[PDB]
Amino acid sequence: APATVCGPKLSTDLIKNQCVNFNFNGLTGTGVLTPSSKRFQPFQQFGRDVSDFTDSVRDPKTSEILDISPCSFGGVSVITPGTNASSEVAVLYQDVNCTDVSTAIHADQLTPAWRIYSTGNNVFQTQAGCLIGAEHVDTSYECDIPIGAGICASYHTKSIVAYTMSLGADSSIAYSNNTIAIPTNFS
Amino acid sequence: ISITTEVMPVSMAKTSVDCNMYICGDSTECANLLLQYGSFCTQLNRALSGIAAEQDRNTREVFAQVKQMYKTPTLKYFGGFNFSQILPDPLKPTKRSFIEDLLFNKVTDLICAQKFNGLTVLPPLLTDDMIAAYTAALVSGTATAGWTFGAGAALQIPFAMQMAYRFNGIGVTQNVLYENQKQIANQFNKAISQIQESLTTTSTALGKLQDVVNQNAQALNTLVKQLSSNFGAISSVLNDILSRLDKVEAEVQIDRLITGRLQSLQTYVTQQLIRAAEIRASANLAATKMSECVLGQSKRVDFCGKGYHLMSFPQAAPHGVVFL
Amino acid sequence: LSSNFGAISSVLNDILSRLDKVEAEVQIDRLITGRLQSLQTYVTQQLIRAAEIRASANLAATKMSECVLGQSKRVDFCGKGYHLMSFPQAAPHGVVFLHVTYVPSQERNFTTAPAICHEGKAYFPREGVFVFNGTSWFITQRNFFSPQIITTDNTFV
Amino acid sequence: ISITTEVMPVSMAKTSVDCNMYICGDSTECANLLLQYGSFCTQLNRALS
Amino acid sequence: TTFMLKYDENGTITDAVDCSQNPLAELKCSVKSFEIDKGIYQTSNFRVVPSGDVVRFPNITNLCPFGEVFNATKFPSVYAWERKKISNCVADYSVLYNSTFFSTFKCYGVSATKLNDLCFSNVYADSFVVKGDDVRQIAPGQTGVIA
Amino acid sequence: TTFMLKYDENGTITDAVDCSQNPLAELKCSVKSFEIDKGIYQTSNFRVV
């Protein structure tokens, strides 16, 4: 209901910024706290997902409508050439987004928390994740290490190259009214 | 001469559920209790990472079948035969067939918003543009070269002379093509126009693939409703149990809730291994069909077509192959 | 085995040597049902993986029947090009086949037609292409330039 | 001419199971207690259906 | 820090890998190997939380409603128990809890330590005085006695 | 009674379904939809005493 019997905690103010330990009337957690356009009849003050989550709340002081997206989790996939071939530094996914993570590696906002990490500088963004470390080159050789949605990593210029995939090679054969082509030598 | 839609599912969604975020959305008071189950994360997240890397191996078994790739021939009319299936460049902004344009509609920078559940879907490693790029050259080379096309480099053959070997491949003599070369050409072009009408409506290329589209995305919909379950706890929400239960009484109530939610992944990740083992068996079938109905003519019967088999054509499909 | 399934420690004889049989039963029956669930996980992983290997063994058994004991006409099942024979070699937990293939190589841009130049109604070949090199018509097998004199036994009406 | 049998299984017993009758058929307090688990009434029954 | 040690066959620690030193070094703790083959792997960790908003309801901010209950005099009988509604009063259960006045404090459903933090929509002091044998018997269940 | 509810994209309840109305409505509460294609479905238990 309109939250009646509260506790002695002082009430701060909301921020649109990501990953806030929100405590809207005993509803703890974290997440992006962006305002949105939802209806919210005055006898409903706590909206949910398609299946049962704290999704959208009313700020009980300011009566504002805002929904919650959770903090940008996901897998982290490092990409390496072989260490006996090259112990050269790995390149990594972050499975969310470029600007959400690149602006979160300027300080301790991720918690794999790599100590020495001279990255990012070559930060791409792909369909799968963000792919921090590797150099995106618009040439296209052949898929060595698969990344996701038609790009692949390898070890070329020696750096790590996040090229988009080439499909085989281009062959020029001519359909004609008359010309057949039969072979002579055979392996 | 009748052509036949045969539809093989070759892949599914590369789902990679985040075992930590699924069981306990971010609360390190929980994640100590999940750490003392040892390896039901990271063996979870390897057993269907091994699916997702394999779900592209299926798509590389099927389409990555010809070595070099072939540009789309311009004069699509091939000695009588119309070929509206071979990815028209100037008309279509997208690079796919017109039949394939009729296929992707009849199912179901896009980034996921990453909901509270802990789920995600990895994108397929071959894009639909690249898959349609394969079925460009698979149709093009079979129309132009045909035979050593599968065996190696392309050896170009005029398409009537190519088909006359395929009639000779049936057993019927080479005479019977050129005796009726116009009548054969019109029956071919009539049969495709039925496919541009039949699978517009009747939902067949839907049917076999929509089983894969539903059931893989339906087991997700069961998996997300296990979070709404109680499992003998007090509150279904994991944040409510940490918020009001002493963190020594919560370690009863959380631990009754983890063993439910961890068992709901082992219900899920087992059934994804088994559905992968069915789709791999359907992809290994389709890797033989593109080898033996497309790159060559098959004589083992009722395998490629439903008669004496002349030739075939791949068409791209969402997580599937539609053969003609 | 070195887990901690809601118990004190998974060194199981330590639980017997500390808790004495009436409170240990709580610390073991929770420790069993997490440990016994790990076998039921493992055997499920082995049943599915055995189904993937049996599917690869039944595929290898058909290659042993067709690529080895005979010659498979169907393309790209045994070898890459046209298939001659195969030599099965033993391998640890596996089979390595050696698919002897044909793969014809040196192609020639020739020119052909079925509408041949003869006063009678035109002919069609029995396994031929009606190839035409410089100022001479021949017929060849489709995958080798073996120029045969266009004759009666090669063609029909 | 030697004819040879070759036996091929194509189907098995189409076994269904009432999940609620298996777990606890007579008790409705247990059926209340089973209800606070997941959709094992549905998904377990739908899987072998 | 998680920290891989390479023991030797004879029993000497010959090499080690710090887990969060490199992401390459992160991989080595994952697959438990030093010679990583070419490819792509996982460690699956992410995204710690900077800030906290603890914003809750009251602008009025009254205080201590139940001081007029427990320190109040008249409690009626068992069956004639009074239900008292509390509106817009910021309660402080920490004042109630640490002062040991109560015999039975079977804090059902919630717990007293975390009871101070969360919010509610109504509380209802249901007050009544029983014979001492039924003090344990006012609980969920316990239906056998007449109280 | 088990009782299905459709919430609109707006948020007002547009339609509801009683589960035990007719055997068409056992299905709608089972598969969680209004539009049912064809075929054969489930919701099981029997026989009060």
Numbering used by the authors:
A (entry chain C): 506 to 662, 672 to 701
B (entry chain A): 702 to 809, 830 to 1045
C (entry chain C): 948 to 1104
D (entry chain B): 702 to 750
E (entry chain C): 260 to 406
F (entry chain A): 260 to 308
From the paper:
By contrast, the SARS-CoV S protein remains uncleaved after thrombin cleavage, and binds its receptor Angiotensin I Converting Enzyme 2(ACE2), confirmed by gel filtration survive assay. Strikingly, for both trimers we observed two different classes of particles during three-dimensional classification, representing two conformations of the trimeric S protein with RBDs in different states (standing or lying). For SARS-CoV S trimer, the structures of the two conformations with none or one of the three S1 RBDs in the ‘standing' state were determined to resolutions of 3.2 Å (three-fold symmetry) and 3.7 Å (no symmetry), respectively. The atomic model was used to interpret the 3.7 Å map after being fitted into the map by domains. The SARS-CoV S trimer can be classified into two classes with all three RBDs in the lying state (56% of particles) or two lying RBDs and one standing RBD (44% of particles). In the MERS-CoV or SARS-CoV S trimers, compared with the rest of the maps, the RBD region in the standing state features weaker and poorer density and has lower local resolution, which likely correlates with the flexibility for receptor binding in vivo. However, our unprecedented observation of an inherently flexible RBD in both the MERS-CoV and SARS-CoV S trimers provides a plausible explanation for the receptor binding process for the two CoVs, as the receptor binding surface can be fully exposed in the standing state. We hypothesis that on the cell surface one CD26 may crosslink two S trimers by binding to standing RBDs, one from each trimer, whereas the monomeric ACE2 receptor will bind to the SARS-CoV S trimer in the pattern of one receptor to one S trimer.
The key determinant of host specificity is the envelope-located trimeric spike (S) glycoprotein, which can be further cleaved by host proteases into an N-terminal S1 subunit and a membrane-bound C-terminal S2 region. In the S1 subunit, the receptor binding domain (RBD, also called the C terminal domain, CTD) is localized in the C-terminal region, spanning ∼200 amino acids, and structural studies have revealed that the RBD consists of two subdomains: the core and external subdomains. For both MERS-CoV and SARS-CoV S proteins, the S2 subunit is mainly composed of α-helices and forms the stem region of the S protein. Here we present high-resolution structures of the trimeric MERS-CoV and SARS-CoV S proteins in its pre-fusion conformation by single particle cryo-electron microscopy (cryo-EM).
